[PDB]
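User: As part of a screening pipeline, I want to sanity-check one entry by hand. Below is the sequence and the SMILES for GG5. Please return the complex as structure tokens so I can compare it with the automated output.
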Amino acid sequence: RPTFYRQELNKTIWEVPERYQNLSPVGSGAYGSVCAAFDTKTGLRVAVKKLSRPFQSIIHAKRTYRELRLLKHMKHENVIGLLDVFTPARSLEEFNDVYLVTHLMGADLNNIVKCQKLTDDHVQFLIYQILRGLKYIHSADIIHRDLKPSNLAVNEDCELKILDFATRWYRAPEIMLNWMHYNQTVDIWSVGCIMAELLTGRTLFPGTDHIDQLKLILRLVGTPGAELLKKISSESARNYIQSLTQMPKMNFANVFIGANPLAVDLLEKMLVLDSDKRITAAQALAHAYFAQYHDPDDEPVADPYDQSFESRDLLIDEWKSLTYDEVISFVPPPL
Ligand SMILES: c1ccc2cc(-c3nnc(N4CCNCC4)cc3-c3ccncc3)ccc2c1
Ligand SMILES: Fc1ccc(-c2n[nH]cc2-c2ccncc2)cc1
Ligand SMILES: Fc1ccc(-c2n[nH]cc2-c2ccncc2)cc1
Ligand SMILES: [Zn+2]
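Assistant: Here is the complex for your manual check:
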């Protein structure tokens, strides 16, 4: 067991092993509070996330367990990973705080797109990295569900990592419509929206609400065709969709004029209304647009990920204990 030391900063209290020094707040949302630190064992600057109210309800405790299970499984250069996880508690009985440690990342893709216009070559590398990480995530039968620029960490090297594995601007239309059975291609839709924004410097679908969001989408990709309509089981959604005035599919070559024609072709394959027809992450990596980065031997898949716990109905204390088990059993990656 390490030696811990206590400290208060930004109201929130932090008790961390002495190996982590020079803590300074970096940014806090609803998830938790993040500090940048200097890791004396490795010499790296790290980000330390303290979970907030990790066991406030069965919802929180299950979420805490799910987060820790995911983070311990992710081992990929383009997916945020765990350098360390610790709790100051010496026993399950006092266990109530959970800290996570990862490499410090400078910015997110939102601060980069908003701070400068990116050349077509930068878009290639950035989107390539997203797709490489997405192929790994999807190979484990995991859907991100909330891909957007502020969820993509990037450093001054332009190396990118997916995090969290208006948000509505990037959600697939079938979600906008409440389809109960969306698949992993919902993430491909988000990547298309992100890629369009990097090329044009403007949000592709800046909807003011879910209804306007869908209107904007159909304006570009067109109203559903007969084959897609045959696939909608919700009688109210089918009724609503058919009641809409019919819109044609726009020519992206005109909408994204001046953009790389290879980029335009890939956008066409990602921003397809019928999710059955969207390009997968693996297929997208092989697209000519990424010829200068694509390496079929260096685009790995993930080990099987057991998600069975998701359908389990347990007490807060059992989720708490299972989270504790996962904290204790952690093995740090190879230095
Ligand atoms: C272990 C595992 C995952 C972790 C995730 C975060 C984190 N979460 N959200 C972050 N946001 C980015 C901005 N909008 C979405 C939330 C950033 C970051 C982070 C990561 C690395 N450098 C700096 C900041 C921070 C620490 C982590 C430790
Ligand atoms: F207006 C739309 C927009 C998107 C879809 C859609 N795309 N992929 C799958 C669906 C879908 C939506 C609702 N129910 C079944 C399937 C269907 C209609
Ligand atoms: F998700 C849905 C579900 C139902 C509808 C709908 N069916 N008929 C009319 C509407 C509708 C709902 C909200 N705003 C305009 C029109 C629209 C979206
Ligand atoms: Zn809550």
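Points to compare against the pipeline: The two ends are 19 Å apart (CA to CA). The CA atoms of residues 6 and 15 lie 4 Å apart.
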